[PDB]
Amino acid sequence: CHPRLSLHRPALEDLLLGSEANLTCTLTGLRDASGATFTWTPSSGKSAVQGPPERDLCGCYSVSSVLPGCAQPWNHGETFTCTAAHPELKTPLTANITKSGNTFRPEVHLLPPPSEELALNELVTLTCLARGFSPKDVLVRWLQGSQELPREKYLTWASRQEPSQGTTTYAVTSILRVAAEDWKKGETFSCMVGHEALPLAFTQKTIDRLAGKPTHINVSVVMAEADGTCY
Amino acid sequence: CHPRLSLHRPALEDLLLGSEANLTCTLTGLRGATFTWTPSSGKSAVQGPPERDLCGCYSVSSVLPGCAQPWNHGETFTCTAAHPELKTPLTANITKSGNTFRPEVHLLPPPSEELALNELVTLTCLARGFSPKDVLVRWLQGSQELPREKYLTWASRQEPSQGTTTYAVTSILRVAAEDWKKGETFSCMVGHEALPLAFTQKTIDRLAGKPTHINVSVVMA
Amino acid sequence: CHPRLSLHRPALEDLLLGSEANLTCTLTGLRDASGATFTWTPSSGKSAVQGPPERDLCGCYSVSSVLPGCAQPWNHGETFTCTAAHPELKTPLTANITKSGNTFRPEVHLLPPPSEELALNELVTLTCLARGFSPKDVLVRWLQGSQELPREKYLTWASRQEPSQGTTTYAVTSILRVAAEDWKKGETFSCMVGHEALPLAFTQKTIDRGKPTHINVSVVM
Numbered sequence A: 001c002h003p004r005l006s007l008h009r010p011a012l013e014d015l016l017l018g019s020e021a022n023l024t025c026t027l028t029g030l031r032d033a034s035g036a037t038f039t040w041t042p043s044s045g046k047s048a049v050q051g052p053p054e055r056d057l058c059g060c061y062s063v064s065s066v067l068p069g070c071a072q073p074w075n076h077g078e079t080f081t082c083t084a085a086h087p088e089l090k091t092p093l094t095a096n097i098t099k100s101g102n103t104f105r106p107e108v109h110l111l112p113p114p115s116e117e118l119a120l121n122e123l124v125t126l127t128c129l130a131r132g133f134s135p136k137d138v139l140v141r142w143l144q145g146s147q148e149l150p151r152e153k154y155l156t157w158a159s160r161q162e163p164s165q166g167t168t169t170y171a172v173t174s175i176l177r178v179a180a181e182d183w184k185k186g187e188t189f190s191c192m193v194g195h196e197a198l199p200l201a202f203t204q205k206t207i208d209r210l211a212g213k214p215t216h217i218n219v220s221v222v223m224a225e226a227d228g229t230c231y
Numbered sequence B: 001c002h003p004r005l006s007l008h009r010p011a012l013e014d015l016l017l018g019s020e021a022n023l024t025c026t027l028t029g030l031r032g033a034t035f036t037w038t039p040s041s042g043k044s045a046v047q048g049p050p051e052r053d054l055c056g057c058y059s060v061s062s063v064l065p066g067c068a069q070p071w072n073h074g075e076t077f078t079c080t081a082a083h084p085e086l087k088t089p090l091t092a093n094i095t096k097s098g099n100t101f102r103p104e105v106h107l108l109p110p111p112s113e114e115l116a117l118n119e120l121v122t123l124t125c126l127a128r129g130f131s132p133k134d135v136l137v138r139w140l141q142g143s144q145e146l147p148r149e150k151y152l153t154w155a156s157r158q159e160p161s162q163g164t165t166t167y168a169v170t171s172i173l174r175v176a177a178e179d180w181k182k183g184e185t186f187s188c189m190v191g192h193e194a195l196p197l198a199f200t201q202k203t204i205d206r207l208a209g210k211p212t213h214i215n216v217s218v219v220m221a
Numbered sequence C: 001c002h003p004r005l006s007l008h009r010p011a012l013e014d015l016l017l018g019s020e021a022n023l024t025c026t027l028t029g030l031r032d033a034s035g036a037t038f039t040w041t042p043s044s045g046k047s048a049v050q051g052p053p054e055r056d057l058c059g060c061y062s063v064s065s066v067l068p069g070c071a072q073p074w075n076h077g078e079t080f081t082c083t084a085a086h087p088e089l090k091t092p093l094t095a096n097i098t099k100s101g102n103t104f105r106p107e108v109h110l111l112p113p114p115s116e117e118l119a120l121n122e123l124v125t126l127t128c129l130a131r132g133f134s135p136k137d138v139l140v141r142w143l144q145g146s147q148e149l150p151r152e153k154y155l156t157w158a159s160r161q162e163p164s165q166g167t168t169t170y171a172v173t174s175i176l177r178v179a180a181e182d183w184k185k186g187e188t189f190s191c192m193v194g195h196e197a198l199p200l201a202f203t204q205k206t207i208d209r210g211k212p213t214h215i216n217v218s219v220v221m
């Protein structure tokens, strides 16, 4: 069928936890093949390698090419443009992308286990909610004590758009299931959220047994010398 | 392109609420068609009036109506289709699922960091541990059901265990702080196949997250 | 005394569990010739099937038929008609029924357990109360935790009419007794109420061991 061309921003985990930041420019809907080429406006090292094509719906050619080393121009607010010409269309196509403006930072919340899970004494679950952030890219990582847990032990959903009270914002959730003996020893668990709009690119919250559905509040205030010639 | 057919279970929103439960046998082809179910059941099917998709095969489908009871009784349905552009007549079949499990529903109180801004408070509903992945989530305020455009539910993913295969889902609802202060109640209902009464409900209000007792001691010495 | 004809309405249990529906049209009063054939105004393919002439006392052998498949036109608001022909009645008569209108949503309350029997520590009584619904049809079931109890552990009264301002509503009650051991431990219980004026066909209220907060403030000099 008829072709199309798009442009994709770099992935979030490589801009936060990494060094390299590859853009990409793809070309789908091509009939058989091409000996095509691309165009990038900053080209101080633009080894735009292509690689092999893939096979798409019913039979289609889909080839693409990436551009390495573009982290600090992306963070400074620059602009990138891709444009390709090929046999199987009349005119060259074009596309552009830029770093987003007018963003918001998330509100992170970590919730204690429900009351009826603590009685059966087998496993408990903790919930991590992030809310109200403007681009839809986000990461979630869990810790036990001060050591990171492996990725295959929890479940994270996707970022979706919430009902509107003004500006459009997003939200995401996650749950982690831990042993009910570690909750009663006094171990602490922590939830980390990384986003484009946060100051140092990560923030965290922490919870344990004494903080959350506490059923007891103990506080003792001692004031030593209230009548004591304050100079 | 390529020819391919499938069957589809009836939708849960009509198996649970009001019994008009259809059963659809679709097919992608014409690179006139027939269908035949193994229960004849008197009332014949309809042939789909043949939308095409994605520059490819002009797809046609068929719908057998009235399958609310024998789906629940445990029968088997098969659909066999035929087209001139096919070598042999194709087939598939579908039944009701075995070894099901019922979900555990929890409604969580809002976080303490949020009530100090006087804007809106958020409530969180969680359903966990059910084996067939079809489920419904609805919210209420008192007795009035809220419209669908007022809240947000996610998809029903598969949770990481090793015993068997179970699933989970979440949902949030943001209500006004003045209604939370006034003492109104909000509910979360969940519909599933494996529940004996098809629904279960949890309720919450501004109390019952409040602590049991507080001990303060000031020592002026 | 006269051989009378009547018409019923479908039972709320299977109408709310969704799988089928019935509608029965009765003639009794005299043991006559069993030429009792019955005429229904609509027929959704499968017509009426009369059973046996079911026996009764002192010659009052009844004759009555029932057609199946009356979920969708009954819920939409159709108007059904029944008439019979058996030789004693030479001039039979019309029987029209209709889904009721102007319904009210009920109010359900669960009351905690009087401390007079809580002092004795043998058993406690829980009371579920419904009030303010327009037709005289309910379903009351009890649960514990997330498991449903069998129907022989509790009793339930019938639906009386309350006298109040202007219009006519109704009320039901029931009573459950449970061991004080796990109730002291903290096991939770719940009461469900089924009605056709509710949007999702059910409501549910739970209860658990309403206490306020204790506050201890001490100053030491």
Ligand SMILES: *[C@@H]1O[C@H](CO)[C@@H](O)[C@H](O)[C@H]1NC(C)=O
Binding pocket: A079, A095, A096
């Ligand atoms: C980016 O592309 C859009 C077309 O989607 C165009 O309207 C806009 O002017 C372009 N901006 C730049 C800076 O090229």
Ligand SMILES: *[C@@H]1O[C@H](CO)[C@@H](O)[C@H](O)[C@H]1NC(C)=O
Binding pocket: B093, B094
């Ligand atoms: C029916 O479906 C089962 C699996 O769902 C399949 O193994 C079988 O071949 C099908 N056909 C029959 C029983 O004719």
